Amino acid sequence: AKPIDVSRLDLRIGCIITARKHPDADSLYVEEVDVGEIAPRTVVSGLVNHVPLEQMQNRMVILLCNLKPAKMRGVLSQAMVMCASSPEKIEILAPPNGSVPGDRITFDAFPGEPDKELNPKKKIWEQIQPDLHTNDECVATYKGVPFEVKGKGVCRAQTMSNSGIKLEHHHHH
Ligand SMILES: [Hg+2]
Ligand SMILES: [Hg+2]
C-alpha cells in the first residue's frame, strides 16, 4: 500500500483569472483558476471576510488539485486554495516569484505519486493535515520540510508563523 504522507496530495501553482461573489452564497467566492491545464478550474472559496474580492484578482495561489470535486450551493468546486489559518486570521499561501500556473509542489524526502482522486471516506487528507504548518519564518512546510517549487523557492504566508494549514475548516472548531 502507498504511504500516508504528503506524497498523496497533488499541489500545484495556479492563478485566479476571474473572481466574483457566489450568486447564491453570502460567504463564498467563485473563482476560475488557471492551473496550467487546457482550461481553468472552478474554485469556490469561503474567504469573503478574509480576502477582499479586489485582492483575489490575478492572485497566484497553491491549489490542492486531487480532491473529489464537490457541489457548493450549485457550483462544483474543482480545487481548493491552500491557506495558513487559525481562529485569528487567514492568509493565502504565496508561491515564490517566477512560479507559473501548473508548477508542482514536491518533496524529495517523500517519494510517490499523488492519488488520482482522494477518497474522502479514506480520510487521507485528515491524517496529513496535522503535519501541515508554517514554520517560524512563515514558510509553509510538511513535517518541517518546505513547500518548494524546484529552482524557484519556497511558499510562505505573509505574517502567519507556526500556524496550521487548511483549505475549508477556516471558520469552525
Ligand atoms: Hg497571476
Ligand atoms: Hg515570518
Obtained via which technique?
A: X-ray
Q: Name the closest ligand to CA 94.
A: 1
Q: Calculate how far, in angstroms, residue 120's C-alpha sits from the geometric centre of ligand 1.
A: 30
- b/e map of 47-61 (b: 16 or more CB within 10 Å)? bbebbeeeebeebbb
Resolution of the experimental structure, in angstroms: 2.0
Q: Is there a contact between 164 and 132 (Cβ–Cβ < 8 Å)?
A: yes
Q: Is there a contact between 163 and 157 (Cβ–Cβ < 8 Å)?
A: yes
What separation in angstroms does the CA of 90 have from each of 60, 151, 173?
16, 28, 14
The position carrying cell 498523496 is 8
| 79 SS3 class | coil
The position carrying cell 486531487 is 66
The residues placing their C-beta within 5 Å of ligand 1, an ion, are: 15, 58, 60
Q: Calculate how far, in angstroms, residue 67's C-alpha sits from the geometric centre of ligand 2.
A: 29
The CATH class given to the 1-173 domain equals mainly beta
What separation in angstroms does the CA of 91 have from each of 150, 151, 157?
23, 24, 6
Q: Name the closest ligand to CA 134.
A: 2
Q: Name the closest ligand to CA 154.
A: 2
Residue 20 to residue 53: CA distance in whole angstroms:
7
